């Protein structure tokens, strides 16, 4: 398929790797009894391994010649061959949480900046204001775009300190 | 020897002279500040370059500057 | 392809476009571009030996390129 | 030809390693400590 | 109690509580959703 | 009476100053013919831990 | 101003009112500089004239039956001779390059040496259709509008050929045969997800 | 009192301590900092230095040729260049015992010799050298040329021979002569040598100075060149069964563009190289007539620079005044030259390993590894030097009044934005590359290799597919048979090129995977961080908020004292100093990647690299620990072999590196106090105080300490990696 890779559901090395992991786990399990805590723990780990391999093959991931999955970072290839869940959707998810945290911190700084002692509000966190801004940050992309359109997101050149060149 | 210079931003606070450990700086009369005094460096031949005077200067930017020059026996602070 | 015809035609053609077409433009750009030798000539348009050599070099290069491309049979 | 003799390394290696560095070191050391008039 | 809440509002205590909450949330997410590699 | 009013806010125009392009509160303006009569106090300290400095009449702009 | 490209939007201040084809369309503000706007005017007029001639020629060849504009230079690449209006032309590719290069170099050299002239007149106007400058305003607008339209038409010719493989008339006949079923959204090249 | 040394600095000569010797030795080449230095004298001193350097280079080349002709086995290596190891020179060490003598006695010699890794054998054999007489003649000729250059360097400093100041500033004439003469004529001469000597010698015909005037390089004899039928020169080329050095299957063509590589030697065709040099010679000669010097026609670089300002004012004044700030600043020219040289050096390393130009060079694995690593480290040092000289230009030769509003002033206008964005790029790359590596390491440690993140490098693989590689399956451009780009080269060079790029047995566009993607990101991190340090040091060299007057202190100075919180490593010299470590680390990563990928390719198991290059444990165990077993076994209680010298060099580099750590961690004060105690001890010791010092012993200065620690760090680093690389590659193959 893409870049000479084969799907994990039809790769021989993938199945051999799964059999290798299950074989070493079963080999470690043969030394214990049947109704003991280590045996139950090993069986739980084996079930987790089976579920993980089944879920990875079910997701349609592309495996290589080593039997391990590969991620598709190109937006066109991901949206064209059903690989948007690898690197596209998590990218936008991180962008939302990253801008979320950044906007919450920026709002807290700008809010405490006009007070009498901002340094005290920086070392001793004002939990009520921080909690209110944390709950209000859900609309961070909308607020950031509206701030950018109004011209209030950036500071002017004359109000920023610079070197003597 | 090192080059010690005094600029016109000196407020005559006399802190740089007290911080000098080898008696290089002094105070002379002046008419550019309220204290009517100004720092001077007439014995730069004994300066080692510790820059204690620069640390003790409170003006922004500094009024006393030390530039490392030719090294000698007095400038290197050698007892031998 | 005849080499003499191609080389002669290419050189004469570029010397013609250098003397009757791009002479004024080259003179105006050379003036604004600002121990030496002044090459005085009796040409009414100032087409000295230096311009002749430059245009002839360009013509010979283009003619030999045409001859080579046609020699490749493509 | 330009081929050196068989004994050439046995004489040029000790030369370049002990004769030339000693002479060069002594000459340079004397030159550094020369006092100006 | 005001002084105690102010002490709990300091940077290290808030950082400890916040990181404990975030770490616990991530651990519980990986516990109820074992081995998530894709969406 | 010459210079900025006491207690006002001015911007520093001295390039070599730590507070270049920064706002500071005016403390006192010397009435003599000194080169730097304006005294400006800033909330943020410099690298040396100083919050006050002396600037000239043209080195400060009202802002 | 001939019109407004965006009904209800203020026209740019750097665009003069008496410029031919002045519709106030300049979102990138490329003509803000007066010197740049001067060169852009003659550049647009020259481009429109060349595109008008090119579109007329590409339409005429396919309307008469001598292939499309893309198949026109196909004779010089694999043992062929140029045929103009069904008449044989005794000129090889090398001879055409020399003649065209010399002729175009002379013409463009005189035009460039003239100093950015957009409306020469005189020898270029033997019929005298623009003798008076009062009536040339309504005729210059037609030239710039037809030039812009022909520029878009030639760009469309190249795009439709690169996306389908057929000539301009062939794409028109197919579209007239099946409009809904044969357009740019059905070639599989223009919009990939359609 | 005042000493004679140094003669260029009376202040340093008056220094009565040991600092005088160190500073005089480290400031001898700083011509601008001497006593009584003018511009004309400065340029003359640099001219003499250039001649002396050229003489040294030529003498070194002659020495290599002479030693290969004397103690080497070039006459026997040419007959069997696959199973015979090259010999560098003999070894005469009285410290060697009997086992060392028989251990180093290899390569068919009669005594202990060193096996060369420089690759001069393949290069000389490819250009035409066959007998030792040729090497001897070349060595004698190069020695005489070096002597002439030395005499020229001495002659140009005497009166009636010293060039004027205006002569050194003739940029138009110098650039026209270097583009047309030093570049075009030299390339044309090389084409003449390849067509007249290399090509006939590779086909079994000996052509030398005694018979080249009577042997025709082509059966048509210059006729197709004058008649314009150049296509006749490419007729009848070398067939696929041609044997290098013999006439079996040899063609008669002299200028072709077949492409690919030779089937036997696995190197570039000589006819293609000759054709290449001819085309670039024509291009360089034509480009040599661009600037006006003395005949009216041409250009003026000042006019082109001043006529390149955008009307929108985006670049401010554009390039106005750039001609004066560059022609009058030697540091600017040196920085530009070093930047271009370093980039070209990296280009040379990449092109030589991927496209082997010398015969039987691909089979020599040690030669490839050593050459690539050597050129990459040299390029890294040269790049750091370019940025260092740029900082020196800002401090010493920058004039804000002359450069007002141009691009140069605008660089310092928004330097904070540049440093901030470089910091963001470096931070992002470092966090993500380290995070992915640690994640893969944890997955490999927990027994779940399928859980690690392996992003497929689709962009570089897409580029490879565009070049003609069909392994990925994109099938476009040169990969698709119905494309115009593919059908337009099928008759000129695409057959050989496609046959060579699709073959997985060469180094021409190797297959890449997630490990290659990750290590490429590490390379990008190293490049961006090194650029960040160098760029920040060059822009902040004239001053910042901490030191508003750094331009008045020079390029290199210790610090500004402990005031203002501390000003350690505040000069631009210190920025370069911290950047050298990042350069060494970046080149270390690129050389590690090259060595491991090629080692796994030569061993026939590329899957080992593809599976262990995603986690750092694989790099530490499967590459650094697995390939050093033979290196550290050079000498042990059971005896020794020829690999003991590399083991000693390995430990030598480790010791030098650790010694550098001392000058890097411990600082002056402690050492000065210790020295004072030693001074008292010597002054109060009988039978020894009679011998007094002539220079007062003092501790090394801060700048000297940084330089000494950096020098030890770099020397140990280079020697350790070179020893490990050569030992592992030589023992494995």
Swiss-Prot record, chain C:
Alphabetically ordered keywords of this record: Chloroplast, Membrane, Photosynthesis, Photosystem I, Plastid, Thylakoid, Transit peptide, Transmembrane, Transmembrane helix
GO cellular component, one term: chloroplast thylakoid membrane
Membrane-spanning intervals of the chain: 5-25, 49-69
Subcellular location: Plastid, Chloroplast thylakoid membrane
Membrane topology listed for this record: Multi-pass membrane protein
Biological processes, Gene Ontology terms: photosynthesis
Physiological role: Not yet known.
UniProt similarity note: Belongs to the PsaG/PsaK family.
Name of the protein in its database record: Photosystem I reaction center subunit V, chloroplastic
UniProt source species: Chlamydomonas reinhardtii (Chlamydomonas smithii)
Name of encoding gene: PSAG
Residue window of the full protein shown: 32 to 122 of 126
From Swiss-Prot, chain E:
Keywords: Chloroplast, Membrane, Photosynthesis, Photosystem I, Plastid, Thylakoid, Transmembrane, Transmembrane helix
UniProt feature coiled coil, ranges: none
Transmembrane annotation, as ranges: 7-27
Record has Cytoplasm as a keyword: no
InterPro entries: PSI_PsaJ, PSI_PsaJ_sf
Keyword Cell division included in the entry's annotation: no
GO CC list: chloroplast thylakoid membrane; photosystem I
Membrane topology value: Single-pass membrane protein
An example Gene Ontology biological process: photosynthesis
SUPFAM superfamilies documented for this protein: Subunit IX of photosystem I reaction centre, PsaJ (SSF81544)
Superkingdom: Eukaryota
Protein localization: Plastid, Chloroplast thylakoid membrane
Sequence similarity: Belongs to the PsaJ family.
Function: May help in the organization of the PsaE and PsaF subunits.
Full protein name: Photosystem I reaction center subunit IX
Encoding gene, per UniProt annotation: psaJ
From Swiss-Prot, chain F:
Family: Belongs to the PsaE family.
GO cellular component terms, semicolon-separated: chloroplast thylakoid membrane; photosystem I reaction center
Domain of life according to the entry: Eukaryota
Membrane topology designation: Peripheral membrane protein
Keyword Hydrolase: no
Organism: Chlamydomonas reinhardtii
Assembly, per entry: Interacts with ALB3.1, which is essential for its insertion into thylakoid membrane.
Keywords on record: Chloroplast, Membrane, Photosynthesis, Photosystem I, Plastid, Thylakoid, Transit peptide
Protein name (record): Photosystem I reaction center subunit IV, chloroplastic
BP GO terms, sorted: photosynthesis
Subcellular location, record wording: Plastid, Chloroplast thylakoid membrane
This protein's encoding gene: PSAE
Role summary: Stabilizes the interaction between PsaC and the PSI core, assists the docking of the ferredoxin to PSI and interacts with ferredoxin-NADP oxidoreductase.
The keyword Thylakoid is annotated on this UniProt entry: yes
From Swiss-Prot, chain H:
Binding positions (phylloquinone): 671
Short name of any one Pfam family annotated for the protein: PsaA_PsaB
Binding-site residues for chlorophyll a B1, renumbered to this chain: 654
Record-linked SUPFAM superfamilies: Photosystem I subunits PsaA/PsaB
Enzyme Commission number: 1.97.1.12
Cellular component terms (Gene Ontology): chloroplast thylakoid membrane; photosystem I
Leader sequence residues: none
Catalytic activity: reduced [plastocyanin] + hnu + oxidized [2Fe-2S]-[ferredoxin] = oxidized [plastocyanin] + reduced [2Fe-2S]-[ferredoxin]
This protein's name: Photosystem I P700 chlorophyll a apoprotein A2
Highest classification ranks of the organism: Eukaryota, Viridiplantae, Chlorophyta, core chlorophytes, Chlorophyceae
Chain's gene name: psaB
């Amino acid at each position: 398929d893409i870049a000479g890779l084969t799907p994990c559901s039809e790769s021989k090395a993938y199945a051999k790797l799964e059999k290798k992991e299950l074989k070493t786990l079963e080999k470690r399990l043969k030394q214990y009894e049947a109704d003991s805590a280590p045996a139950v723990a090993l069986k739980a780990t084996m079930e987790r391994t089976k579920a993980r391999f089944a879920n990875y093959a079910k997701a349609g991931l592309l495996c290589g010649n080593d039997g391990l999955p590969h991620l598709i970072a190109d937006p066109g290839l991901a949206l064209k061959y059903g690989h948007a869940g690898e690197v596209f959707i998590p990218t936008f998810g991180f962008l939302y949480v990253a801008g979320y945290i950044g906007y919450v911190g920026r709002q807290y700084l700008i809010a405490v900046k006009g007070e009498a002692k901002p340094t005290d509000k920086e070392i001793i966190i004002d939990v009520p204001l921080a909690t209110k801004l944390a709950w209000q940050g859900a609309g961070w992309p909308l607020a950031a775009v509206q701030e950018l359109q109004r011209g209030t997101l950036l500071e002017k050149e004359e109000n920023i300190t610079v070197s003597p060149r | 020897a090192h080059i010690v210079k005094i600029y016109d931003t000196c407020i005559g606070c006399t802190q740089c002279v007290r911080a000098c450990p080898l008696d290089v700086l002094e105070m002379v009369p002046w008419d550019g500040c309220k204290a009517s005094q100004m720092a001077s460096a007439p014995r730069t031949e004994d300066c080692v370059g510790c820059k204690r005077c620069e640390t003790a200067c409170p003006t922004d930017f500094l009024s006393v500057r030390v530039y490392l020059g030719s090294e000698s026996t007095r400038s290197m602070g050698l007892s031998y | 392809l005849d080499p003499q015809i191609v080389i002669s035609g290419s050189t004469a053609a570029f010397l013609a476009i250098g003397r009757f077409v791009f002479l004024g433009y080259q003179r105006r750009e050379a003036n604004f571009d600002s121990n030496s030798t002044i090459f005085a000539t009796n040409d009414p348009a100032g087409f000295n030996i230096i311009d002749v050599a430059g245009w002839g070099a360009l013509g010979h290069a283009v003619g030999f390129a045409v001859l080579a491309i046609n020699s490749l049979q493509g | 030809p330009f081929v050196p003799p068989s004994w050439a390394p046995s004489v040029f290696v000790p030369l370049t390693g002990l004769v030339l560095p000693a002479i060069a070191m002594a000459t340079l050391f004397v030159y550094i400590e020369k006092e100006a008039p | 109690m005001k002084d105690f809440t102010t002490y709990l509002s300091t940077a290290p205590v808030i950082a400890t509580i916040w990181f404990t909450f975030t770490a616990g949330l991530l651990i519980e997410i990986n516990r109820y959703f074992p081995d998530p590699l894709v969406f | 009476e010459v210079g900025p009013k006491r207690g006002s806010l001015v911007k520093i125009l001295r390039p070599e100053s730590y507070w270049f392009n920064q706002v500071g509160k005016v403390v006192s303006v010397d009435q003599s013919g000194v080169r730097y009569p304006v005294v400006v106090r800033f909330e943020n300290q410099n690298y040396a831990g100083v919050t006050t400095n002396n600037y000239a009449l043209d080195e400060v702009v009202a802002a | 101003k001939a019109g407004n490209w965006l009904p209800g939007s203020d026209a740019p201040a750097w665009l003069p009112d008496d410029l031919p084809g002045n519709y106030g369309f300049d979102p990138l503000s490329l003509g803000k500089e007066p010197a740049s706007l001067k060169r852009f005017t003659e550049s647009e007029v020259i481009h429109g004239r060349w595109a008008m001639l090119g579109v007329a020629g590409s339409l005429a060849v396919e309307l008469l039956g001598y292939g499309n504009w893309y198949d026109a230079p196909l004779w010089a690449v694999n043992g062929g001779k140029a045929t103009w209006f069904g008449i044989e032309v005794p000129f090889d590719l090398n001879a055409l390059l020399a003649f065209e290069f010399v002729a175009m170099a002379a013409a463009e050299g005189q035009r460039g040496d003239a100093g950015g002239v957009v409306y020469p007149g005189g020898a270029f106007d033997p019929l005298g259709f623009a003798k008076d400058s009062s009536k040339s305003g309504e005729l210059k607008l037609k030239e710039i509008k037809n030039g812009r339209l022909a520029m878009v038409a030639f760009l469309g010719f190249v795009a439709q050929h690169a996306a389908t493989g057929k000539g301009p008339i062939a794409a028109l006949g197919e579209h007239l045969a099946n409009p809904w079923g044969a357009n740019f959204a059905t070639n599989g090249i223009s919009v990939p997800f359609f | 009192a005042t000493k004679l040394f140094p003669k260029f600095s009376q202040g340093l000569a008056q220094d009565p301590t040991t600092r005088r010797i160190w500073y005089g030795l480290a400031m001898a080449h700083d011509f601008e900092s001497h006593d009584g230095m003018t511009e004309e004298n400065l340029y003359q001193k640099i001219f003499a230095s250039h001649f002396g350097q050229l003489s040294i280079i030529f003498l070194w080349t002659s020495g290599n040729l002479f030693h290969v002709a004397w103690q080497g086995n070039f006459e026997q290596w040419v007959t069997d260049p696959v199973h015979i190891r090259p010999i560098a020179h003999a070894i005469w060490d009285p410290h060697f015992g009997q086992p060392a003598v028989e251990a180093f006695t290899r390569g068919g010699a009669s005594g202990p010799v060193n096996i060369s890794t420089s690759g001069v054998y393949q290069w000389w054999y490819t250009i035409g050298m066959r007998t030792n007489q040729d090497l001897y003649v070349g060595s004698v000729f190069l020695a005489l040329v070096s002597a002439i250059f030395l005499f020229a360097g001495w002659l140009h400093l005497q009166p009636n021979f010293q060039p004027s100041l205006s002569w050194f500033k003739d940029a138009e004439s110098r650039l026209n002569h270097h583009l047309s003469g030093l570049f075009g004529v030299s390339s044309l001469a090389w084409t003449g040598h390849l067509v007249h000597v290399a090509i006939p010698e590779s086909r079994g015909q000996h052509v030398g100075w005694d018979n080249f005037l009577s042997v025709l390089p082509h059966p048509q004899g210059l006729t197709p060149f004058f008649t314009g039928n150049w296509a006749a020169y490419a007729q009848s080329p070398d067939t696929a069964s041609h044997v290098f050095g013999t006439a079996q299957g040899s063609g008669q063509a002299i200028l072709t563009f077949l492409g690919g590589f030779h089937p036997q030697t696995q190197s570039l065709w000589l006819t293609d190289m000759a054709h290449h040099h001819l085309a670039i010679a024509v291009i360089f000669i034509v480009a040599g007539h661009m600037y006006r010097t003395n005949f009216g026609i041409g250009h003026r670089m000042q006019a082109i620079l001043e006529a390149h300002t955008p009307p929108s004012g985006s670049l401010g004044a554009g390039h106005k005044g750039l001609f004066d700030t560059v022609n009058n600043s030697l540091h600017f020219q040196l920085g530009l030259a070093l930047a271009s040289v370093g980039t070209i050096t990296s280009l040379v390393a990449q092109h030589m390993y991927s496209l082997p130009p010398y015969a039987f060079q691909a089979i020599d694995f040690t030669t490839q590894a050593a050459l690539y690593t050597h050129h990459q480290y040299i390029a890294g040092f040269i790049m750091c030097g370019a940025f260092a000289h740029g900082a020196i230009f800002f401090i010493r030769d920058y004039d804000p009044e002359q450069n007002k509003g141009n691009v140069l002033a605008r660089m310092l206008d928004h330097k904070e934005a540049l440093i901030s964005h470089l910091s963001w790029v470096s931070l992002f790359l470092g966090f993500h590359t380290l995070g992915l590596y640690v994640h893969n390491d944890v997955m490999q440690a927990f027994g779940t290799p399928e859980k690690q993140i392996l992003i497929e490098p689709v962009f570089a693989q897409w580029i490879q597919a565009a070049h003609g590689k069909a392994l990925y399956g994109f099938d476009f451009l040169l990969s698709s048979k119905t494309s115009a780009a593919f059908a337009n080269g099928q008759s000129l060079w695409l057959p050989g090129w496609l046959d060579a790029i699709n073959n997985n047995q060469n180094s021409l566009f190797l297959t890449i995977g997630p490990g290659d993607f990750l290590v490429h990101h590490a390379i990008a991190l190293g490049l961006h961080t090194t650029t960040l340090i160098l760029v920040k040091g060059a822009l902040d060299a004239r001053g910042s908020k901490l030191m508003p007057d750094k331009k008045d202190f020079g390029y290199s100075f210790p610090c500004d004292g402990p005031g203002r919180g501390g000003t350690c490593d505040i000069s631009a010299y210190d920025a370069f100093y911290l950047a050298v470590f990042w350069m060494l680390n970046t080149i270390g990563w690129v050389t590690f990647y090259w060595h491991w990928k090629h080692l796994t390719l030569w061993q026939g198991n590329v899957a080992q690299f593809d599976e262990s290059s995603t986690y750092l444990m694989g790099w530490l165990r499967d590459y650094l620990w697995l390939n050093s077993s033979q290196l550290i076994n050079g000498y042990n209680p059971f005896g020794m072999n020829s690999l003991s010298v590399w083991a000693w060099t390995f430990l030598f580099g480790h010791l030098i590196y650790a010694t550098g750590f001392m000058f890097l961690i411990s600082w002056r004060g402690y050492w000065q106090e210790l020295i004072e105690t030693l001074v008292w001890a010597h002054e109060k010791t009988p039978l020894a105080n009679l011998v007094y010092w002539k220079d007062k012993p003092v501790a090394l200065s801060i700048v000297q300490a940084r330089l000494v620690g950096l020098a030890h760090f770099s020397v140990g680093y280079i020697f350790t990696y070179a020893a490990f690389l050569i030992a592992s590659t030589s023992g494995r193959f």
